[PDB]
Structures are given as structure tokens and as C-alpha cells.
Design a protein around this ligand. Structure first.
Ligand SMILES: *Cc1c(COP(=O)(O)O)cnc(C)c1O
Ligand SMILES: *Cc1c(COP(=O)(O)O)cnc(C)c1O
Lengths: 405, 405
């Protein structure tokens, strides 16, 4: 950097600490990733200076000819990537993409059916302390208590009993492929719209490693960050018939001016995702998650659902008599970043939990492969099986440092 | 830039067009400004890679030690700048800052009193196609038909009749100082909270050139961009007693993960605003607006309210028999950027209007002074008084090019 170090030493020192931290730790938090230098340069551009309320060619302010080109590049590349008929690349976040779909199809107090928050559903899928739960009446479907796979008969029974106006499929912590075709079949049976929130798996969807929700859902929401490896922000995909309403929900509905510099970065990330090497990257993400899962089972760990079909896995720590909070804390002591995460039918609260969630998108971006996954599992086994040994923790620290250089 | 030109020629060419456009035009849109290189570098940082839901020292994820330092720098510098007891620097935009205050104090269908949208109120102050108007019952107060100054007796009569739960003061197109003390006196009379949306005037407030709403309002919302000259985003200021509720409204209430790289940029902009040269800058903004106003009146233009006390002015184009839409279009032909804007009691719709809104924050940032304001007014007079003369428009183009180099 050139001007920040001189204008603001305090902010610059903190950023530099964060940059070095990203390199030194082993990032296993499933929602994380490292964006390219080109994506960062796009969001570090002069596009932050432009007001551009409205849409390309339909703006409220003049002088938007060149930010219009950027926004269209983002929309057209998104459409090529996911095969959607319409894209809205203005959502400030995944939360705002969800908020706008809800604002489009629901009235205050309408019934919504989404995944149980303890089984993998997201905060914006009905938490009582989130706007979703406050504004609407959310009901939940769960996973099977033994297989930990969504119970599609439970989705259908809840739908038929509660008659939701909207059904939400997808999750922040579900390690198996979701059957969007069954979700649409149930939605049609009860006359509900189907919304798929693919935030966690969007990069896998783009690389063809997860079934695409686009053909089955009326609305698809997502973050541009996460497995898609874009800048932090949101996006909505939908059929041509809801395009005008979705665009109006975003603006003048729920947001004001869009972040054009972040939209430029979304276009950049979409161009990267359209390339063949992104598909090779995504395959390594899923391959690494399978490998890591297997290596952890080899150390004696129990995994929710027995493994994974995607980028993430959940360790049920009950057999080791540990809470997710204890495991997260001791792994933090050795340089391994995970987050505690409730598991299906968890006996512990969401602030303690009996599990940890792990994803491989970030370590895959940094070049880790199968041999690194084996070592990561071996380190986690060493630590979690020896939480009271400072000897074991120091060894883990040295093995973590050997992986990160 | 280094990596963007090679990774994405299309996005890079469009950004470069936009950068050159920002230099070549005379930006008079009142909400615009040009941020520093340090602010852009902060938002172009690796902080986009970090999830940090929650607040400093109270995060849901580990590894937030250094983004915590950045967020606290933003909160503490905001508090020094505005003298507020609490700051929330997570709002993704001014719209989301407003949404969170509304989510904090109001229930669905509650009555809110805000400034008439045709007289200066913002979209998020009750437009029927915005969430504010859809979620709540907005009633409006107006300005005097001749002086164009807020009628404080009308604010009080509407408050006493409608018994709003919340009163909103401030605007996107009001050229005079707002009396927050009278707004608080009325709010107290009817037992309503007072929210001040200072987005447009936050830089003037910070430099002491506009009365500060902090001591009078329960909640203060703002954009970090605009006169404050920060990155695009929002912020909420409030007393200690509403801090926990405001923080909960932002998260887990209405947003998900915050944009830590943008928060770093907010801190940078706040540090710039705390410096003596920002105060000199702000004075030149108001001085230039007064000068421009006077020079326009010298050309024969009528200004709403007869002038300005801040960074913006509104030209009532009725005397020249022009709509704001016609004036905006012909000024765009010569390189001068303005936006059509309804005027109080406008006979034309909001899509046509009888006025143009003009602000000096952006041209002041680029170094323009009093002599430049005189020339800008002279060019606007030449163009708007000779809309059918291609001769006059070509002369204006050459005079605009002489100012921008
Ligand atoms: C991450 C996520 C979100 C919200 O995204 P933000 O950018 O944090 O607001 C919504 N839904 C799912 C399924 C997610 O994983
Ligand atoms: C600009 C503005 C907003 C909204 O800001 P965004 O960043 O465009 O969402 C809200 N209120 C006022 C008074 C404004 O000027």
C-alpha cells in the first residue's frame, strides 16, 4: 500500500496484523476464503464515489454510462455462470439478498418454512432475534436423527400442515447435497414459492459439483463471498417473470445507492469463476473435504451425516466428551481456526454446542491438497485427544507452522 | 492498478473510463464527493476476507483481534468527531442505518412523522415504494410555501394530531439549517423518540458548521459518504441507553457479517475529518455554496428558500419556463452534472420536476474556490438561458473544459 501507511499508521498497523494473521493460521471456518488481488483492486477503485440508484440504462442520476457497463458485466457473467434468466447484483450482503426476496413475496406475518436453525438453517431463515423471525411466521423442517439428512417427508408434512407462502431450502451448515427437485415438488403441492439460499455452496454450483437450484427455484439468493470466492456482498437470481419485482424490492424497496466498486469486484470474481481453473479449484475443495472427513474418521472422530458431499463437515464431539466451545478454544491456541456449531438434536445450547464446523475452501485456495488434509486431521486428533497436555499443543503449533510456512 | 488490468480487461477499461469521467466533468450532484487514496486502499484490503459477526471483543468467530482494533478505531473516532456516547459503524448504507433504528423503536404499522418527500425528505422517510412506507404509517410535515423553511408549527400540529411514535428530522434536499432543539421540544411534547438523519450534512456537523443533532436526538443516522467524504456505508450514533438495542438491531437484527474493509475505510475517513484541514475544507464547501448561490441569483435564477446555509442549493426553474429534467439533460451535454429535483409545492411530478439540486462538496474537494463558483454560475446561466443554441452549448463545453483542465 502507498497512502494508507502515511495517512493512518494505526489503521495500517491493524490491517498488516490481519494480513499476516490470514497467512499464519490454518483457516477452517467454512464460510471463509481468500479473494484475488484483482477483486481487491476493483473494490479499492474510484467507483465508491458514484451514486447510481436504479439499474443500468434506467438510473436516477446522469454520468452512469461506465458503472452501467460494470453492472451489466456482473449480471451477464452471473447469468452465464448459473444459467439464470435474471440477476440482481446490488444486494449489499447475503442477508439483504434474502430480505429483498422476503419483501417481494411476503406480507407481514405470512408463514415461511425453512430448515431448522439447529440442523443447518441460517439466522435469516427465521431466527426470533432476526428480522425474518420477527416479521414472518417461520416453521421448520428437520434432518433425520440418525442419518442427519434432510427428511423430505418432514418437509412435505410441515408444508401441508402449515401451508407456507414460501419454502426456503439451503443452509449454512449442512454437509450433504440438497435435492432441489424434491423441494420444488413439495412447493408445487402446497402452492408455495421456493427460495434456495445457496450462499455456502455457490462456488460448487458454479463449477458443476453441486446440483444447480436455478431450474427448480423461483428465487435463488447467495453471497458473492464464500465458496464463490468473491467480494463480500449478495446477489439474487430469478426467472424473467419476477425480475421487475425483485429489482424493485432491492431498489427503491430495501436499499439506497448500490456499492458500484463492490459490484465491479463481483464481476471480476464471476469472470474468475467462469474460467477452467476455478472448476479445478472447486473440485479440489470437495476432494479435500472428502479426504479431510476420511482422515478425521481415521483419528476416531464422528462426523454428522457420516461424511460430506460438499466443502464442509461437522464433527460431533460427544464421543470425546468435548463441547464445540472447548474444541474451538484449544484449536485457536495452536493456530487452527474453526467455529463451534450445534449439531442435529444437540443436547447443548447454541452458545456451547457439541460440535465444530470445518470447511476446506480457504485452505484449498492457498494450495493445500490431500497430504495437507491428512496432516490437518492428524493435528486435530493430537490436540482434541490431549487437551490438557501443553506438550501436545506445542507440537501441534509446530506442525501448523510447518503447513503455513 | 496492477492485477486487474491483466485479469479483467473489460472491467478495467470501464473503471478507467469512470476514473477519467470523474476528472473531466464538473460534479454538482449534492450527494457526491471524492474519497482519498488512503480510504480506497483500506477498502481494497484483505479485510474483505474476514467474517466478524458480533462486535469487538464479543465476536461469534475467533481470529478477530485485529479487525476488532479497526472497528474500535472507527467507533472511538466517530465518538470524538460527533460527541456521541455510542456509535455503530456496521451499517452497510444510510438506508440500512435508518432501517435498524426503525427496527429498534417501531412495531409494524406504527406512526412515524417525517419531512414531506417533495420538500426535502428522503426515500427512506416514508416513500410508499420503500420499506419505510410499506412497514410503517408515515405522516409528513412541510416547509412554508413562500420561505421554503420548515414550518415548525406544522411539525408540532402533525405530531399532536397523529401522535407518532418516532419523529424523523433531516433531509436529502433542504438548503437551510435544521433546528434540532425545536424537533426535540416537539418530540418531548408528544412523547415521541427523535431520529435525525444527518447523511447530507454530516461533514458540516463534524466541522462545526451545522448545529450537531447528537445532544438533541435519541438516534442519529448517517451515510459515511457525502459531505463526510468517507467510503460508501452507514453509521448510527446514539446515547448509551440505546446502545445495546441499536447494536442488536444491526446484528443479529437486520444484517449478517459486516464489511470490515469498509469499516477500516470509515476509520480512515473519520481520522481525516478530525484533522484541522478537514474543517478548512468544510468551510470552503459552505462558503462556495453561498458564493455559487449568489452568483446564480446574479444570473437571474430563483433559489428555493432564497439561498443556502449549507452545501446545497435548489434552483426553481419556473421563471425560465424549464423543467428540472430539461435542465439536467442540457447541462449533461456540456459536462455539468446535476440532478432534477422537485421543489416545494412543485406543479410537476417527481420524474419531471421544476428544479435542479446543486451541491459544492465534490468541486470543493478538487480545489475549486470562489472564482470557480462564479464561472460555474455564469456557465449555467449561458446554457439554461440559451437551450436551443448549439453555439452557446459549445462555448459552455469549452468553459467547462477550462475549469477541469
Ligand atoms: C452467509 C449466509 C447468509 C448471509 O450473508 P451475509 O453476507 O453474512 O449477510 C445468508 N444465508 C446463508 C445460507 C449464508 O451462509
Ligand atoms: C443518502 C441518504 C440516505 C441513504 O443512503 P444510502 O447509502 O444511499 O442507502 C438516507 N438518508 C438521507 C437523508 C440521505 O441523504
Amino acid at each position: 500500500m502507498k497512502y494508507l501507511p502515511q495517512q493512518d499508521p494505526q489503521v495500517f498497523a491493524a490491517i498488516e496484523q490481519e494480513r499476516k494473521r490470514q497467512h499464519a493460521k490454518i483457516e477452517l471456518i467454512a464460510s471463509e476464503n481468500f479473494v484475488s488481488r484483482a477483486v481487491m483492486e476493483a473494490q479499492g477503485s474510484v467507483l465508491t464515489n458514484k451514486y447510481a440508484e436504479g439499474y443500468p440504462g434506467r438510473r436516477y442520476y446522469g454520468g452512469c454510462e461506465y458503472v452501467d457497463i460494470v453492472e451489466e458485466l456482473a449480471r451477464e457473467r452471473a447469468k452465464q455462470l448459473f444459467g439464470a434468466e435474471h440477476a440482481n447484483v446490488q444486494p449489499h450482503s447475503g442477508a439483504q439478498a434474502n430480505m429483498a426476496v422476503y419483501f417481494t413475496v411476503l406480507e407481514h406475518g405470512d408463514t415461511v418454512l425453512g430448515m431448522n436453525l439447529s440442523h443447518g438453517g441460517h439466522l435469516t431463515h427465521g431466527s426470533p432475534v432476526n428480522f425474518s423471525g420477527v416479521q414472518y411466521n417461520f416453521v421448520a423442517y428437520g434432518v433425520d436423527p440418525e442419518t442427519h439428512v434432510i427428511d423430505y417427508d418432514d418437509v412435505r408434512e410441515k408444508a401441508r400442515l402449515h401451508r407456507p407462502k414460501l419454502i426456503v431450502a439451503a443452509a449454512s451448515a449442512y454437509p450433504r447435497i440438497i435435492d432441489f427437485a424434491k423441494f420444488r415438488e413439495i412447493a408445487d403441492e402446497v402452492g408455495a414459492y421456493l427460495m434456495v439460499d445457496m450462499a455456502h455452496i455457490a462456488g460448487l454450483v458454479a463449477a458443476g459439483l453441486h446440483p444447480n437450484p436455478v431450474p427448480y427455484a423461483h428465487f435463488v439468493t447467495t453471497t458473492t463471498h464464500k465458496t464463490l470466492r468473491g467480494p463480500r456482498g449478495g446477489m439474487i437470481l430469478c426467472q424473467e417473470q419476477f425480475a421487475k419485482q425483485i429489482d424493485k424490492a432491492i431498489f427503491p424497496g430495501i436499499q439506497g445507492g448500490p456499492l458500484m466498486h463492490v459490484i465491479a469486484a463481483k464481476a471480476v470474481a464471476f469472470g474468475e469463476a467462469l474460467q477452467d481453473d476455478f472448476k479445478a479449484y472447486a473440485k479440489r475443495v470437495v476432494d479435500n473435504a472428502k479426504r479431510l472427513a476420511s482422515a478425521l474418521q481415521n483419528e476416531g472422530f464422528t462426523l454428522v451425516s457420516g461424511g460430506t458431499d460438499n466443502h464442509l463437515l461437522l464433527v460431533d464431539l460427544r464421543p470425546q466428551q468435548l463441547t464445540g466451545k472447548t474444541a474451538e478454544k484449544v484449536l485457536d491456541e495452536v493456530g487452527i481456526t474453526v467455529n463451534k456449531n450445534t449439531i442435529p438434536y444437540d443436547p447443548e445450547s447454541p452458545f456451547v454446542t457439541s460440535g465444530i464446523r470445518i470447511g476446506t475452501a480457504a485452505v484449498t485456495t492457498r494450495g493445500f491438497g490431500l497430504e495437507e488434509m491428512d496432516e490437518i486431521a492428524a493435528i486435530i486428533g493430537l490436540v482434541l485427544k490431549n487437551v490438557g497436555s501443553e506438550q501436545a499443543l506445542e507440537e501441534a503449533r509446530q506442525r501448523v507452522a510447518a503447513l503455513t510456512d
